[PDB]
Paper text:
To parasitize a phage, the SaPIs employ a transcriptional repressor, Stl, which in addition to repressing the SaPI genes, senses an active phage infection by binding to the phage-encoded anti-repressor protein. Here, we show that the phage satellite SaPI2, which does not encode orthodox anti-phage defense systems, provides antiviral immunity mediated by Stl2, the SaPI2-encoded transcriptional repressor. Stl2 targets and inhibits phage-encoded HRs, including Sak and Sak4, two HRs from the Rad52-like and Rad51-like superfamilies.
The most abundant particles revealed an architectural structure formed by fifteen Stl2 dimers acting as a molecular filigree decorating two heptadecameric Sak80α rings, keeping them apart and generating a ~ 1.5 MDa structure. As a result of the asymmetry between the number of Sak80α and Stl2 protomers, two Sak80α subunits in each ring were missing any CTD density while a further two had at least partial albeit extremely poor-quality densities, which were left unmodelled. The structure instantaneously elucidates how Stl2 is inhibiting Sak80α by interacting with and corsetting Sak80α’s CTD. To our knowledge, this is the first visualization of the α-helical bundle present in the CTD of a full-length Rad52-like annealase. An overlay of Sak80α models revealed that the CTD was fixed in two different conformations, either up or down, which in relation to Sak80α’s ssDBG might be seen as open (up) or closed (down). This flexibility in Sak80α, provided by the loop connecting α-helices 4 and 5, is suggestive of Sak80α’s mechanism to load ssDNA onto its ssDBG (see discussion). Despite the modest resolution of this region of the map, it could be perceived that Stl2 employs its two loops in the CTD to interact and fix one Sak80α CTD. Mass photometry analysis of Stl2-Loop 1 mixed with Sak80α revealed the formation of larger peaks corresponding to 1 and 1.5 MDa similar to the wild-type, while mixing Stl2-Loop 2 with Sak80α did not generate such peaks, thus indicating that the residues mutated in Stl2-Loop 2 were critical for complex formation. When Stl2 is present, two Sak80α rings are ensconced within a Stl2 armor, preventing Sak80α’s CTD from engaging with anything beyond the Stl2 cage.
Author numbering:
A (entry chain 3F), C (entry chain 2F), D (entry chain 3E): 2 to 223
B (entry chain 4E): 140 to 204
E (entry chain 2G): 2 to 195, 201 to 223
Write the structure that this text describes.
């Protein structure tokens, strides 16, 4: 689950740097652990933080027994047309290529407190290559059978907002990694001849891996 | 372009002399280093014109100084 | 703070292996984490355990805001006579050497919930090289000013029995490491020519590092 | 803390050289120690000066128990555009480059007489490259959250004017060193081909290190 | 000038290590500075100590406007007798040799708070050798003209006990270096055959102390 550090210091009003100066914990590690993204934590860290904030681990750690495990299709139904519109001169994923379609199945083995586990199948298809900035884009996917997985949404929204955001992050990150992996195997290296802004030269590979595809559906609104 | 190299040489020496007139030690090899040219005598015209831009700007700034 | 895994599974009656088969966590790592000795843990690990045991992190982690930080003398008052009674032929620390005296100061900066911190000085002297087995011995130390640090004992016993045992472990381990470090720098290598039992050959260094010196005083009974 | 030599000899009207001739102390060392900048002092020096001035160390050492410790961001939010305006030909920091922005956090752990310590966070941003002389410039920074640190200012102004000036010096010097360090790592050497005044040729590095950036805010007026 | 950190800690019973941890200062430096042995002090150190001990620098630095300066004769009146026998058994300067005479005047200026200063001349002659240890013997010099130094005793004991001890330490070191410099030049090194010491090194280690009614400690 996730440490409630972000919620804790938001309530306290303190800053990560201020906490780090107090508990003698490295700023980078502490700020990363402040975010729920960190997958590992140290007992030293939990001791120092719980003491500094004068709180038991109960408040420090937010846990919901409902475990959401996600599995993706070994082979997806993916078609990626290659349209090389000067990607090397303009670093836009659109200029490098375009997803004709990308549909596959995401199996979610939602587990309650009891070992009883319910599996939900998600027919997820690529919908649009949303352009967040002129520099980078975010692939957007959509669940065709989301109406079938209405019970899944009931379970998702049954959790805390922080835990809901943590799931959304986990889903987005897994999906991004999966999509970037598939595309990088399907699309040849398209090195950017001119560094972007002249600051650094990044190959299409670096762009697609950097590209973060967040699923969009009523199942996962926030 | 021997005519260009005379114009470039006259301006870079003038820049050196103005620096010395300003009381700032100046040597031709250093002003050549500013142009980052290996041989003043043999150079492409566009580079002589590009060099001029450097010297004229620098020559004017010591005037303001 | 310590994870109460040992207490949790003792109450449940379950075995570490049984839990590992259930939560898909490596037996060695899980059994180490079951002991309070582990200094690191994973959010995935706490998620899986809290869910398996159907309990909030409150029960999973036991935290007392009273932090006991220990510091040792850079230079101790140590005298170690060398009596080489055939250590190579008989692997007994006594055969290798003997501590004439080993006294030094252990500063404990006990911190309450408030930043108010109280420091207790421990005049700790070597008392006896207790022989746990015919193979290895445990150095025993004693606090001369333990009566002065009666307030420290009041704070120690004010904690939970599990946390008290964790402190005792931490103190013993730090003291062992310190003593072994000093001795190994003061005593030359006395390699054991004949492997012990023929199973393996271990140098005096390995024996003293293996040697675990546990402090003995009324301050720390259990 | 600071020695009051400058204030002492200003009141006496005596000159440093005159004092040095009297107490047999090196002029350079004594004049440096006359300024509060020196961080080290000799017992012989305090004996000779206290005797010469016929005063107890009370009048020599101005001490206020309020300790102001300053810490800076390991990584700042700094953007430094490079403008190649003939720095070599003209030794002006503006000609070498320009700070687009330089904001970061300065943590001040103000400590009262009691160990109770209060930490103040300073969002400090680059404001203007003030040109003190045609030869050199001083970078000027400003505290965005200075209004939040109004209590800090209350503590600053609660000290003596000499001690206030000493803090301002310390803050300026730390800030200058920090800024020059960051810039010298971010900007390549821009050696000056023609020495100004023919006295010496100085690389931009020497200029930026020489450049002294003094923070400007209502927190620190004098 | 007398650091009272040492005294202050004895007052409060605070261990040197405890103070060093609290004020984030090295134990070695703090203990060296505790008896005002080091002749250099950091502004940071005194600031931290004053804040930590809740004291003004007045209770840390004790200064008596009075100043004492000691000048030794460029040429002393000394005679040497070298036995060269018995040094070998165990480090012992007395068996190796001894100083038959070592009478010399030390010009001491006791400066008052008023610019005027008082010059007092004390003549110290070799009295005997102190067997502080079998390894080390400290030469003893007695003041012949203690009559001229009656006011010297009054000024000396007019200072605080710590300051007196400081003076005694300084004069002892100065005398020891003076006599060692004078003697080592006239003394050939004797190897300690019975980890390796030369009679020269013995001379360097051997010190000297002025035993007189003017300086009893």
């Amino acid at each position: 689950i996730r440490n409630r550090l972000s919620e804790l210091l938001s309530e306290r009003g303190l800053k990560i740097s201020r906490v780090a100066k107090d508990v003698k914990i490295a700023r980078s590690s502490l700020t990363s652990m402040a975010q729920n993204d960190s997958e590992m934590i140290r007992y030293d860290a939990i001791d120092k933080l719980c003491s500094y904030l004068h709180i038991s681990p109960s408040e420090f750690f937010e846990h919901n027994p409902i475990n959401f495990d996600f599995t993706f299709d070994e082979e997806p139904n993916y078609k990626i047309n290659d349209v090389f519109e000067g990607f090397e001169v303009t670093a836009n994923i659109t200029h490098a290529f375009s997803i004709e379609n990308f549909d596959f199945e995401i199996l979610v083995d939602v587990e309650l407190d009891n070992r009883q586990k319910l599996n939900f199948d998600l027919d997820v298809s690529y919908k649009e290559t949303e352009k967040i900035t002129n520099s980078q884009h975010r692939f957007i996917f959509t669940i065709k059978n989301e109406d079938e997985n209405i019970g899944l949404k009931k379970y998702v929204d049954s959790l805390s907002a922080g835990l809901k955001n943590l799931l959304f992050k986990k889903i987005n990150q897994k999906l991004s990694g999966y999509v970037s992996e598939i595309i990088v195997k399907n699309i040849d290296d398209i090195e950017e001849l001119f560094p972007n802004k002249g600051e650094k030269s990044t190959t299409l590979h670096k762009e697609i891996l950097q590209t973060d595809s967040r699923l969009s559906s009523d199942i996962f609104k926030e | 372009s021997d005519n260009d190299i005379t114009e470039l040489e006259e301006r870079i020496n003038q820049f050196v002399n103005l620096s010395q007139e300003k009381g700032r030690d100046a040597t031709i090899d250093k002003t050549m280093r500013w142009l980052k040219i290996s041989n003043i005598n043999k150079l492409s015209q566009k580079q002589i014109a590009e060099a001029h831009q450097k010297l004229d700007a620098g020559l004017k700034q010591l005037d303001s100084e």
